[PDB]
Design a protein around this ligand. Structure first.
Ligand SMILES: [Co+2]
Length: 9
């Protein structure tokens, strides 16, 4: 989850 979101951002 953490990196899914940071990539999206
Ligand atoms: Co990150």
């Amino acid at each position: 989850l953490a990196e899914a979101l940071h990539s999206a951002l």
